[PDB]
Amino acid sequence: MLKKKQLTVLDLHPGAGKTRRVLPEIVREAIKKRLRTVILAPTRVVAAEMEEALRGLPVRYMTTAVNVTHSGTEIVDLMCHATFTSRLLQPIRVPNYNLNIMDEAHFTDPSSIAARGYISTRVEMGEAAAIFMTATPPGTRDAFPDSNSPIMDTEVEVPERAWSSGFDWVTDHSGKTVWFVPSVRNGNEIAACLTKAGKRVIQLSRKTFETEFQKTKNQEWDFVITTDISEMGANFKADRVIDSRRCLKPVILDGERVILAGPMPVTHASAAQRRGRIGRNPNKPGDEYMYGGGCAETDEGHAHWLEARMLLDNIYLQDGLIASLYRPEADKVAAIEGEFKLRTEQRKTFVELMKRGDLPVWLAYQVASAGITYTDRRWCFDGTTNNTIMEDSVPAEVWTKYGEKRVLKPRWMDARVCSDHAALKSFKEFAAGKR
Numbered sequence: 001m002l003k004k005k006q007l008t009v010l011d012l013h014p015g016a017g018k019t020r021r022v023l024p025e026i027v028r029e030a031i032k033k034r035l036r037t038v039i040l041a042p043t044r045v046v047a048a049e050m051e052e053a054l055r056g057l058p059v060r061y062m063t064t065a066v067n068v069t070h071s072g073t074e075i076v077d078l079m080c081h082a083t084f085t086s087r088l089l090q091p092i093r094v095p096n097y098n099l100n101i102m103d104e105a106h107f108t109d110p111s112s113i114a115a116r117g118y119i120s121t122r123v124e125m126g127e128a129a130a131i132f133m134t135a136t137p138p139g140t141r142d143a144f145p146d147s148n149s150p151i152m153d154t155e156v157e158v159p160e161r162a163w164s165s166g167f168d169w170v171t172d173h174s175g176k177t178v179w180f181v182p183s184v185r186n187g188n189e190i191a192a193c194l195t196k197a198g199k200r201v202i203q204l205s206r207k208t209f210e211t212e213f214q215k216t217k218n219q220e221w222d223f224v225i226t227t228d229i230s231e232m233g234a235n236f237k238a239d240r241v242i243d244s245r246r247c248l249k250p251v252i253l254d255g256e257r258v259i260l261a262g263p264m265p266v267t268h269a270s271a272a273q274r275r276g277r278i279g280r281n282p283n284k285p286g287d288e289y290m291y292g293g294g295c296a297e298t299d300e301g302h303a304h305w306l307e308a309r310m311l312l313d314n315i316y317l318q319d320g321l322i323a324s325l326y327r328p329e330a331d332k333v334a335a336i337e338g339e340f341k342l343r344t345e346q347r348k349t350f351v352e353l354m355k356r357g358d359l360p361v362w363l364a365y366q367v368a369s370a371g372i373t374y375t376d377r378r379w380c381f382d383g384t385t386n387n388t389i390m391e392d393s394v395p396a397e398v399w400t401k402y403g404e405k406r407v408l409k410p411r412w413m414d415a416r417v418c419s420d421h422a423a424l425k426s427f428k429e430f431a432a433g434k435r
């Protein structure tokens with residue numbers, strides 16, 4: 001695998017030992033061959049688990065999730081997928097890694113897609129080798145892969161709202177369930193219904209993931225209500241998965257706004273990863289997988305692929321050349337390579353709006369491409385009346401940095417800035433000039 005000019009897809013079934021058994025062997029061989037190596041983790045929780053499996057080995061952990069005293073002579077770097085892409089975007093010099101290992105290489109967040117594109121372009125050019133570790137590579141059509149012990153698969157109606165009757169099977173279970181919901185708001189409704197019924201529920205989402213995941217280990221629970229984030233290597237001691245089989249899809253309408261379409265079916269890779277949370281212990285057969293819908297290829301036209309093209313267009317590769325998307329996922333967006341390439345100052349604003357501003361890639365691009373500087377927030381209030389953001393059935397209001405009370409009405413509308421209460425609270429703070 002380690003031979004230059006080669007991209008290998010390590011596609012062992014979920015729980016086959018790609019992280020705790022295969023990755024340390026690859027690391028030992030890379031160190032023996034003096035290959036400058038990067039290890040890419042999807043999240044900080046996976047980076048902490050990687051330290052446990054790589055313990056003893058000389059690895060430089062470029063994350064504050066690990067507390068290790070580095071020796072200074074490590075030739076292997078470990079960081080999150082988003083850290084890798086962020087460092088490529090910034091003026092900082094990133095080593096031209098000879099070996100690029102991406103764990104959970106199925107992650108469809110814009111920075112993961114961008115990192116796959118940059119890495120695969122370097123391999124195609126003959127400059128490096130790469131290993132993509134995932135049971136579900138782009139284009140998988142099997143929602144029921146192999147497992148460590150047999151799983152009982154059952155197609156069943158799954159509640160997406162609170163219920164009073166008709167789903168006795170959900171609460172009459174005495175084990176631990178991981179339930180995948182299409183959104184934070186839908187998860188709040190179901191978590192509330194389960195709590196009123198006497199259950200102990202933990203809720204997981206992108207913003208709360210590292211903090212709340214620790215609760216699955218620190219306390220006894222009955223249910224874990226989660227969004228699609230738990231498809232990226234999150235491990236639980238569960239005996240059942242309840243899967244709505246639904247997700248939200250960000251869509252760019254008329255090139256002028258982003259909506260959260262759906263809930264709509266998940267891909268075969270997502271359904272296989274959700275199911276993959278159980279059937280992992282060979283000494284415990286009979287783990288249950290209850291699914292409430294079918295699969296579809298809902299990544300075609302999904303905004304994350306257009307956003308990944310916006311990131312790659314602004315990453316230097318070689319003179320005027322631009323990284324292509326990883327070939328099995330390149331058709332998911334209709335995009336001209338180089339069309340989002342920004343001049344130096346606009347690119348600096350684009351990066352800052354995503355890093356400090358915490359804005360979605362598409363939204364950051366509209367603002368920076370319009371020649372607006374990072375601290376200029378006049379665009380958060382000068383949009384059309386149909387762009388009025390609503391809070392508790394009434395228009396959302398903020399005090400501007402000038403001391404004026406104004407209705408939040410952004411020039412460009414991205415439904416992700418107000419998809420839940422935490423999201424709207426952060427966008428109000430941004431519109432106020434608080435970061």
Ligand SMILES: COC(=O)CNC(=O)C1CCCCC1
Nearest residue numbers: 082086109110111354355361
């Ligand atoms: C779910 O989508 C996101 O989180 C998009 N955000 C990113 O990828 C940024 C990470 C840090 C700077 C570069 C881009």
